Write a protein that binds this DNA or RNA. Structure first.
Lengths: 80, 123, 205, 86, 82, 127
RNA sequence: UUAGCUAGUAGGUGGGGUAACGGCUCACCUAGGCGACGAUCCCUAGCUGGUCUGAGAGGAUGACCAGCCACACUGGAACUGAGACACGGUCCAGACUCCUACGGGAGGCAGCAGUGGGGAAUAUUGCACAAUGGGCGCAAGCCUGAUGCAGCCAUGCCGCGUGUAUGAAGAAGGCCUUCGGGUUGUAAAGUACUUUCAGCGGGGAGGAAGGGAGUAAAGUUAAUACCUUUGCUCAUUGACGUUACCCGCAGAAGAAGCACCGGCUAACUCCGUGCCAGCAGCCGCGGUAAUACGGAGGGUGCAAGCGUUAAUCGGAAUUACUGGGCGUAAAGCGCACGCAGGCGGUUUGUUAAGUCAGAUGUGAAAUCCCCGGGCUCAACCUGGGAACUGCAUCUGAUACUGG
């Protein structure tokens, strides 16, 4: 039972943290067009191994800071 | 037209503007008679129509019709007004409720009495 | 809650006999049956489409003694029910107790039958029912209660009844003054110069 | 207060308040002695002080003045630090 | 605690009770955990009038749910009926 | 201020009677209103006494408003005419301050206190 | 007709802190964090189940019932406690009011009644813990403006009555009329006949389960005590209440009004008035024949209501997703370049986010709908179902879209 998210690294500046963006398509409730929506998550990156632009697999965990409730599971693709 | 366009700017229904704002979504309002007078109507009609200016309990001051044949109303008369324009009298958007508060019923009415505040005649 | 005024006026306005009197008399010897009431009865109505729909609904209402509110509710129920709405409307009317009391011949008129009902002279399944609009069901047995059995209205009512066409869906024992609502009447049981679909049209627009 | 028991409750809660205050102030004192030893670098003074503190953070927990978890952290925390020095 | 009791629905002069398991503090006709029977005191008794899921009642008792005086009666009555 | 009082068995039976007395008192009110206005038999006053003063009175007690008004009509003269408008049963109110707002008048009371909603109106407009 | 916002700010280390994770807090360090996928600022607002409307998609809405939140005179605070930063607790400050022997005290109806005030407008300072449920107690019981009930108001929904039948040259009166007659009208009077409801007497369910004395049996125990459980008998517990309902008595007796009749729109004539007085939802009526004003007779539609006003949706395909338009009717920016954005030719492989399938959980109850059941029927109450067209997880499918 390993619920997980996949997204790409938009910021790697913070010490041991990263900002990840999860993008998805969604049907528009009224006009039916499929629209891009993005969800940015502050995620934990102990060891700072995640570079900007990387594609990373993340999971939900307990609060790590005022805004971090997610941590890194592993890198998928890097340095496009 | 475009879906894209509506997705940026949704259909937006126009909000209906009222014809009796002084009532503020109340069925009647109370008010004091400021002026009680007559006025002439618009093409093609011709008469001396009874109207009054009325300061309402909510501050609004409006002109109101005094329907029926004959009325005993003057300044400081406290009356009840209801919605209802007078078409050949521009500006006039309310009617006075005959037979409420200081406004008497129409004298000697037999038909449509309840629209003129007239009790049922003993008979 | 009941129409209490002159009755033949109603027949005269609708252009037909509405059976609002016993039937002892040719109706034309009691009123000018083929002329509307009033100063301008002789006048002909060049009658709008809405007009014909209204008058047909009035006709049925005036036959059964039903005012607008209850009759509209009857339409609503006919509509909700399965099958043809127009026919469902007539089933509901024809199932009323005041009506059934009339059809078994206990009352000379639906008005008289209604009075029988209201005045606790009618039982359903040996149980007293005194509300006119009580819906009667298949296999029910409606009867004149013992104390009301010697009323001369009832004997006369049963005599006239014997001279009307005899309804199929009712089994009446004139001696016992009891009778059985065998089944709901079909459409074919009821008069054919009733235009229900007009009434159905009036209430859908 | 207006109601009979409401009056009584205010009286009782004040008594309890002065009871709890007294025991609570005592307890923090004995906690503070340990942190003060630590900040002066003495194992013994700080262990000694920890031993006096132990039974009373435990007891005040049993007595509802504080929860069990609070007593534990204090013991955990001080124990961590004193060991880290000597 | 958790209790099994009657929430009074029905109409004026025609009481109809819904047997329910609930936190005893919630209002009588308010939040409940599980519905578990009903009780019509005005039933013609020609047919039914009192129905209890005794399996779930017991399950809740087994976990410490208490029981009304009136539900405790219904249960003895229904146990007698069959 | 005074009258004959009679208890009844049920209130519902006494509702129509009470409303009946209002109708008669209202009918004579409009009757006395039509006469006084038509009594002059002319569109205006024959002379220059048209200038008048208006007053607004609300007294806490019902006994006074009828009694002192009679004495208040005694001081009336041909030159200057004074009339009471909207005699109250007690205190003060929004529609009373509004009554003095339309026509300039003095607002007086035998005994009264200002309501919270009353002060706002009186303090705002000049009264 | 708001484009930039942010120093506990974003993160890191460590100490402290909480019931618990956490910039919750503090020190130090890094310089981040948010934002055109609308931050910041401004206006407004409790959210939901659902409610009203609509064929639907929508539109409007959030009383009554139920779930969550927030508040308790205003601003702030913590104390007690499992729980509160406490609706009839405490403390401070503010606004305000009451008591006082003048020195000092007291209080907070957005609990239930009730009062003043505001308003077009919204009820009694009632009865009872008998029932359900809550607090305390081993219990008996005590408390319970929760609740059950009663009062007031046609506010709405549903039911019923205000009589039934017979009654003609078809009266009198009224109204129209070419004075022949037509109409009101079987309507009335008369004749029998019924008695619901209201009135008055008589009787009388159910909402009552329990609890109390005894008794007997089991489990207990040294014990037949006590305790507890379960059977038995005896005497008892209803605020509503003059209950529902049933029987009897008297007599048609006590019970019909409101709007409309020019077209839209069911219903027409006379008299009065004369661009006046007046009507009027829209068109539009009124200067001598006005079915439109006002009265009358007649008629139409509703009926213990009927009209008028207010208000949401409908019809309105009139904000058009379903479901519209821009040459001349409202609408192509005077023209071009172009960032963001939207869209993107054709083949293979890959992926499996979109999309599709299945499984599982959840989608409170009530409401709506379907078939039944109970109150004399109906409103109403109620059993079971179906529906909640949604969300989420897992496992697949790979044509189309995306990588």
């Amino acid at each position: 039972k390993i619920r997980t998210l996949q997204g790409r690294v938009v910021s790697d500046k913070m010490e041991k943290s990263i900002v990840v963006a999860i993008e998805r398509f969604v049907k528009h409730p009224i006009y039916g067009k499929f629209i891009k929506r993005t969800t940015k998550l502050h995620v934990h990156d102990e060891n700072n191994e995640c570079g900007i632009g990387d594609v990373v697999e993340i999971r939900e965990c307990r609060p790590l800071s005022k805004t971090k409730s997610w941590t890194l599971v592993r890198v998928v693709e890097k340095a496009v | 037209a475009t879906v894209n366009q509506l997705v940026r700017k949704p259909r937006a229904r126009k909000v209906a503007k009222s014809n009796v704002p002084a009532l503020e979504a109340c069925p009647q309002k109370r008010g004091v008679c400021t002026r009680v007078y007559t006025t002439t109507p618009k093409k093609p009609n011709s008469a001396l129509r009874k109207v009054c200016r009325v300061r309402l309990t909510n501050g609004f001051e409006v002109t109101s019709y005094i329907g029926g044949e004959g009325h005993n109303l003057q300044e400081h008369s406290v009356i009840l007004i209801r919605g209802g324009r007078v078409k050949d009298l521009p500006g006039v958007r309310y009617h006075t409720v005959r037979g409420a508060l200081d406004c008497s019923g129409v004298k000697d009415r037999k038909q449509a009495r309840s629209k003129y505040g007239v009790k049922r005649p003993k008979a | 809650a009941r129409y209490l005024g002159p009755k033949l006026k109603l027949s005269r306005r609708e252009g037909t006999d509405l059976f609002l009197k016993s039937g002892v008399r040719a109706i034309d010897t009691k009123c000018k049956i083929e002329q509307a009431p009033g100063q301008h009865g002789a006048r002909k109505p060049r009658l709008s489409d809405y007009g014909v729909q209204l008058r047909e609904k009035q006709k049925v209402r005036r036959i059964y003694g039903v005012l607008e509110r209850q009759f509209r509710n009857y339409y609503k129920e006919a509509a909700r029910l399965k099958g043809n709405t127009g026919e469902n409307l007539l089933a509901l009317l024809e199932g009323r107790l005041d009506n059934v009391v009339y059809r078994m011949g206990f009352g000379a008129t639906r008005a008289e039958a209604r009075q029988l009902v209201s005045h606790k002279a009618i039982m359903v399944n040996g149980r007293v029912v005194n509300i006119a609009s009580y819906q009667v069901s298949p296999n029910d047995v409606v009867s004149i209660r013992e104390k009301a059995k010697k009323q001369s209205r009832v004997k006369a009512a049963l005599e006239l009844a014997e001279q009307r066409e005899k309804p199929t869906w009712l089994e009446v024992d004139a001696g016992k003054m009891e009778g059985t609502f065998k089944r709901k009447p079909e459409r074919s049981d009821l008069s054919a110069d009733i235009n229900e679909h007009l009434i159905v049209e009036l209430y859908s627009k | 207060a207006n109601i009979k028991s409401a009056k009584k409750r205010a009286i009782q809660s004040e008594k309890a308040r002065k009871h709890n205050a007294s025991r609570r102030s005592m307890m923090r004192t004995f906690i503070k002695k340990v942190y003060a030893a630590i900040e002066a670098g003495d194992k013994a003074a700080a262990q000694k002080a920890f031993n006096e503190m132990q039974p009373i953070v435990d007891r005040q927990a049993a007595k509802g003045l504080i929860h069990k978890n609070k007593a534990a952290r204090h013991k955990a925390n001080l124990t961590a630090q004193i060991n880290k020095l000597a | 605690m958790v209790t099994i009791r009657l929430a009074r629905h029905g109409a004026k002069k025609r009481p109809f009770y819904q047997v329910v398991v609930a936190d005893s503090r919630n209002a009588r006709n308010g939040r409940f955990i599980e519905r578990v029977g009903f009780f019509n005191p005005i039933a013609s008794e020609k047919e039914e009038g009192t129905r209890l899921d005794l399996d779930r009642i017991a399950h809740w008792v087994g976990q410490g749910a208490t029981i009304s005086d009136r539900v405790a009666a219904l249960i003895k009555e229904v146990n007698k009926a069959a | 201020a005074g009258d004959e009082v009679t208890v009844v068995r049920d209130e519902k039976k006494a509702r129509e009677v009470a409303l009946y007395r209002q109708g008669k008192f209202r009918e004579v009110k409009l009757a006395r209103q039509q006469k006084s206005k038509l009594e002059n038999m002319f569109a205006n006053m024959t002379e220059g006494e048209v200038h008048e003063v208006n007053i607004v009175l609300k007294a806490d007690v019902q006994g006074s408003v009828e009694a002192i008004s009679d004495s208040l009509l005694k001081l009336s003269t041909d030159e200057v005419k004074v009339k009471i408008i909207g005699s109250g049963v007690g205190g003060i109110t929004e529609t009373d301050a509004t009554l003095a707002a339309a026509s300039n008048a003095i607002l007086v009371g035998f005994n009264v206190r200002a309501d919270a909603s009353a002060r706002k109106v009186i303090e705002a407009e000049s009264l």
